[PDB]
Design a protein around this nucleic acid. Structure first.
Ligand SMILES: Nc1ncnc2c1ncn2[C@@H]1O[C@H](COP(=O)(O)OP(=O)(O)OP(O)(O)=S)[C@@H](O)[C@H]1O
Ligand SMILES: Nc1ncnc2c1ncn2[C@@H]1O[C@H](COP(=O)(O)OP(=O)(O)OP(O)(O)=S)[C@@H](O)[C@H]1O
Ligand SMILES: Nc1ncnc2c1ncn2[C@@H]1O[C@H](COP(=O)(O)OP(=O)(O)OP(O)(O)=S)[C@@H](O)[C@H]1O
Ligand SMILES: Nc1ncnc2c1ncn2[C@@H]1O[C@H](COP(=O)(O)OP(=O)(O)OP(O)(O)=S)[C@@H](O)[C@H]1O
Ligand SMILES: Nc1ncnc2c1ncn2[C@@H]1O[C@H](COP(=O)(O)OP(=O)(O)O)[C@@H](O)[C@H]1O
Ligand SMILES: [Mg+2]
Ligand SMILES: [Mg+2]
Ligand SMILES: [Mg+2]
Ligand SMILES: [Mg+2]
Ligand SMILES: [Mg+2]
Lengths: 302, 310, 313, 309, 309
DNA sequence: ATTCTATGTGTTTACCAAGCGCTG
DNA sequence: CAGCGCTTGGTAAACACATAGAAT
DNA sequence: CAGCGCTTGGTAAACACATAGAA
């Protein structure tokens, strides 16, 4: 029924250790003096645990959470702040970058002092989660007390997440299988959950009841994933670059035409992970395959 | 009658073996747990069977399917999601990339958790949607935002077809239309296609027109070859313009690096037309190379044109 | 000006006419609408007249529309759902000018003959699939590279218009004179066609100017000499070159010896932006064989030497 | 909420023909013709619409006149199946723009929809399923001739009787769990103005009096003292209407008076006197509207126990 | 909430002349010429406006650019007194309609008022008292030449030194009742970016860390440990800016990169990188913006402990 | 209901630089 | 071996198109 | 004394002017 298995306690939250230290310090300090938290902002690549952390913060402060969104919302944002906002409650605006300039101009004046345009608003904390903080206007971006950045997870944390999701769903999986699924993940929790669900479907169709390590490996091979998590399309991109063009500078148009691919999807979907993993370089004369790409595909380095 | 005859079941779908070997597993697993399929994205070059596969998936699941177009639809998408969604029904959007960047933000909270953020009036309220499936087919996945592209549970790529699969498609279309055709004629039409099902159907229709005008009743191999030669297609599907491009490259410029503007002006052709209409298939077949110093004709071009290698 | 009404009156595109005749006959025999057609080529070759001729041959109606005319998808929906009957032909000139949002509304309209529209304007908005009659779309464009690949793959028949031989331009000029009441001879028409650049509209323009010159000269029949004098007055060589192209060739032959000159050096010598010399003057010179592009520079061919009355190398 | 036509209280004359029309429509497997229901306010035309829809076995689309021009297309194209029923309460309040968009959809079942929106864009004609439309207006005058011309069946809602009002009071008492005798409900219905809302309100007030009195059953007499304490006659006039008649008869001799002088005498707003109290003084034969003023009829003299003029 | 010019923290260069202008205007019993305050955002121009108003002894009317065209007329008519100060924060956001209504009120103290609400109607010229208008903006570019020409005094706000930021931190600590030493406040001010809000926020974070540690006094070592736990460098660069510099220098060799490639390498939004992290990397000499991409200067190499190019 | 203004986004265009061959 | 010429590729800066929020 | 002529007075029904509202 539910596949987005969100943890509810900060102890169930897994991977953001250096963020968790500061968050625990701030939350203990705010609870010690019976004072509401400062305004908080979360940003990072998609799928890393912004909304989950907002809900966990709401639970840990022990108050209610009022969830809204930027696309959902100028004259509207002045209503939720007073109509259904209690003292100490948290207002969570997910995807806050989409919020209008006029709507933003009616939000930060109510952030420094809890009054609008007098009407006394109760003590409240604003939590904003977005992928593009650069779209938030400087006046609104300057009244955020805490600004935090979400980092990529290590394979062990991804394995822990896979095991927890398996236990909640009711699937018997081994430590090594979860480690393999986490290793093949792209440092992202959502990718790990998706890969685990695909392996679960493969095992269920095959009739297996326990996902042993070899069963996980064969399921991932059927999915078409390397030891680095590369799909078939990424491997084909690297192979075309190495063979058809000698691995030297190519360019976006030439490489896209050779691969029967759109240049935009080659540049904004497939390339970033190869660049992160060190299998590709964006030389000013074009794209270049690194020695790691040569050795990963079983080719003699130049 | 109809010219876009689509298969209805996964058995009639012809040549996506690698994709089907996993799609069958996913559908069987979804049916076993009595749960709808996780969200799906189909992408690839035009003419390979994305919309047909979406309809086939809808038929296989047994649930209804609602068709939407990406260019058709920011706040509207909330209305379409809320008004006309039933538990298990598949929602299908073609050209999902054409959705504005503001209109996918509304799809963000309704794909991982099935609850929407809407404002009434009062204040903000949360509308809980039924457990549905969204299928999106697009040729440019790089125009879909990263969060939405991450919300998709299953992402698949449509690859090209072998000549035998194109021949099977031609035979199926012929038996559906009411035209008799030989195995070898269908194989020739498939070989002259550019690995695309739409191209194969179009070539078959042109050959049928030629044979019907000529008065022939059964399209044999010889009649098919005559019709294809009348169209002006080689054994690799090259037209006359492609042969002209290769001949001018080999003869006038010596086959070496030339460039785009020079080669286009030597042809009295627009360079954009040359690079976007004729060049990609020549590159795919191996008859042309985009070297850093210009366009170069490969040895395959020399052998195909019947010219001595340099 | 004057439009032919049948495929026999259409002057001089033989391979296209041979390909098109069988398609038209087959469509007529099967009592079915014709496949979608795309006509592309350089301007002035007769795309719109071919569309009208095809519409007359099929015996159906023709609705003419322009690419920039359709600003919004609502206009396209109104045209497709109301103005068109079963088997009618809708002609869009300069398809590549269509906006991509409106260009992508045509994929279902041409493949499935259904159109997806959102109506309701608020919380009551919902999607409808307007059914469409089995119409036919003919599209004319000069820049096929600006048409999206899914759209270009949906055209059943795609054809290219070629330049006219001087004899065909002479036949067109003679037809225009006969339909206009003039008494031009064959040699004058052939000369007017030769000075043309393989285009019909320029041939008609030149014939009309020669007619004006001859009429004010008092002659009742346009002889070859009168046509030559009128064309020289208009400023055209025996190959149709203007004065600017002629002086470009003169400068290249003299100031640089006719050898590899390069684009920048020649442009500076001629005091021209090398974005006008390359795309307005060079293409026709290369077409006529008067100029050659070399990895070292621009080379004037021997035919340019002979045409300009200069000694051979 | 009644469901079948036999559960409806007291529209016997209308129900007799409604049964025939509905049976004939069902036998042909064809949607019923468009229906218009006239009647004074307070008689329950929406309940009759619901009963008709249930009898036909078809869903509803309820909408009032002043609801939102273009929303008519939305409501017609969103949730209308084959033979669906659309009920437009207060159909004389529709705007002229919204009125000149419905009769195409009544005579031909085709609606023109604005598709481009925004600036002056084009429209498309769209086909709708065959449907029946029920209209309910209390002011037939504001219904234009073209709008009235497209309605196949036109019927009138008449005032109830003391017995049907008594049945309604019994139904309400049974729903609320209050014990009431037949004659008490008959008295309550008699003192109502042939309207269901008035009968229910009177029953609730009598219930309050009886409950305060600590009585477990409401009999005839207890209803009588409750209605006497409410200040009501055997005809339904309050103390204010009796005061109006007595002022008209005694102070002015019953002759023509005029709105301003009578209102000044009664210390009441002239509009309040004209639009709240007078309409039931008329319709009972107790008052007249002469061009020279307001006159009291002989029925007013008889009712108040005064000697005739 | 500072009140007088002596209580203001650190605009020594501006205060030295502002005191003279205020004294000269006060001695003449005449309001001072309209003043325009330039400066980067976050430096506190509204506090200086309040201080100026208090020193002149007149009332202040706070207004912003997008306040509501006719609201300017109201604020100029009703709430202006002889010598009153009208402060318009964010004055380059003022609409052109309100733009071509304020310059007659600055050069002649007369304004036209629309009297016929509704249709076009007519206007009447009205006389205003002699007042001073104080404008504040961060972007001088959007100030048109006619608007800039009518300001008698134009002055610039500049970034504070670490010592002035330390004084502000001490004032905030005293207001909040937290004991902090001289050197700790100096370190907090040094690790800020010449802005008061940054210093206050850093002080609050150090306060949270010290309170969790259960320390009654924030000394120097506690401040240094807290600011190290925040990933702050001696220049105030966070971990993300140092990572940007490291990626630019190591992965790309420091040469031109471009926004898209660098953002892809950092897994960041290009607009986020350009508008939130780059501006302080510049202005410190650690980054350059070439037409061929972004380049790391020698200061970046020296700062990160890397060998020079 | 139309007009106008803004902002955010998709698409195109104009430098600028680097590299390979010829050169004389 | 030191200009001259052509050819590719990427980076930033313009356009042009929409929506939405505005007043009239 | 029984029409004819005038003079007053009140009652209801029209106008005409505003606002507000809505797209
Ligand atoms: N520490 C964690 N433990 C368990 N699950 C986690 C954790 N962090 C993230 N997730 C999972 O990450 C998934 C998606 O991330 P969310 O927390 O829902 O929001 P988000 O990741 O910010 O969204 P996007 O699409 O990446 S912008 C959820 O299904 C969570 O279960
Ligand atoms: N596997 C298949 N079996 C049978 N017919 C097929 C198959 N794949 C494609 N076709 C036919 O090919 C034609 C075009 O295929 P589509 O799926 O409509 O195009 P597409 O894949 O959606 O690409 P576009 O233009 O980007 S939407 C239709 O007539 C289909 O019936
Ligand atoms: N004949 C009836 N039988 C049963 N319940 C009725 C009847 N008439 C009205 N009601 C009740 O009246 C309520 C609905 O209001 P109605 O009085 O039906 O509206 P209406 O008849 O249109 O009155 P007006 O004049 O239009 S406000 C419901 O509780 C019905 O049960
Ligand atoms: N120099 C200063 N001396 C004392 N308090 C100051 C000073 N600068 C700012 N403040 C405090 O800052 C608060 C007012 O906000 P400011 O920071 O002054 O707004 P601002 O000066 O306009 O900065 P920005 O860039 O416009 S957001 C009050 O609490 C003031 O006490
Ligand atoms: N084959 C032909 N026979 C006769 N006239 C022609 C022929 N081709 C072109 N023309 C004439 O030349 C002109 C070309 O313009 P038109 O065909 O309208 O647009 P385009 O510039 O796209 O060709 C027309 O006026 C037409 O009369
Ligand atoms: Mg986002
Ligand atoms: Mg598509
Ligand atoms: Mg054209
Ligand atoms: Mg009513
Ligand atoms: Mg500001």
């Amino acid at each position: 029924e539910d596949l987005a298995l969100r943890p509810k306690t900060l102890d169930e939250y897994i991977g953001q250790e250096r963020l968790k230290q500061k968050l625990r310090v701030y939350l203990e300090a705010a609870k010690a003096r019976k004072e509401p938290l400062e305004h908080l902002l979360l940003f990072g690549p998609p799928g890393l645990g912004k909304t989950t952390l907002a809900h966990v913060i709401a639970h840990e402060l022990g108050v209610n959470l009022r969830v809204t969104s930027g696309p959902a919302i100028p004259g509207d944002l002045a209503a939720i702040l007073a109509n259904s906002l209690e003292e100490g409650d948290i207002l969570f605006i997910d995807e806050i970058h989409r919020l209008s300039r006029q709507a933003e101009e009616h939000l930060y004046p109510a952030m420094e002092d809890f009054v609008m345009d007098r009407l006394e608003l109760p003590r409240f904390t604003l939590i904003g989660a977005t992928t593009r903080p650069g779209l938030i206007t400087a006046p609104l971006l300057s009244r955020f007390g805490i600004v935090e950045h979400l980092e990529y997870y290590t394979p062990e944390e991804l394995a822990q997440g896979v095991m927890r999701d398996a236990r909640l769903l009711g699937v018997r999986i081994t430590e090594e299988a979860a480690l393999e699924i986490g290793r093949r993940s792209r440092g992202t929790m959502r990718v790990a959950k998706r890969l685990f669900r695909r392996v679960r479907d493969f095992a269920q169709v095959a009739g297996e009841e326990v996902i042993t390590r070899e069963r996980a490996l064969e399921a991932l091979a059927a999915l078409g994933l390397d030891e680095l998590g590369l799909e078939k399309r990424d491997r084909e991109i690297l192979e075309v670059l190495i063979l058809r063009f000698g691995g030297g500078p190519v360019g976006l148009a030439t490489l896209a035409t050779a691969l029967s691919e759109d240049p935009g999807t080659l540049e904004e979907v497939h390339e970033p992970y190869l660049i992160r993993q060190g299998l590709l370089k964006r030389t000013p004369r074009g794209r270049v395959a690194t020695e790691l790409a040569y050795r990963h595909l079983g080719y003699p380095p130049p």
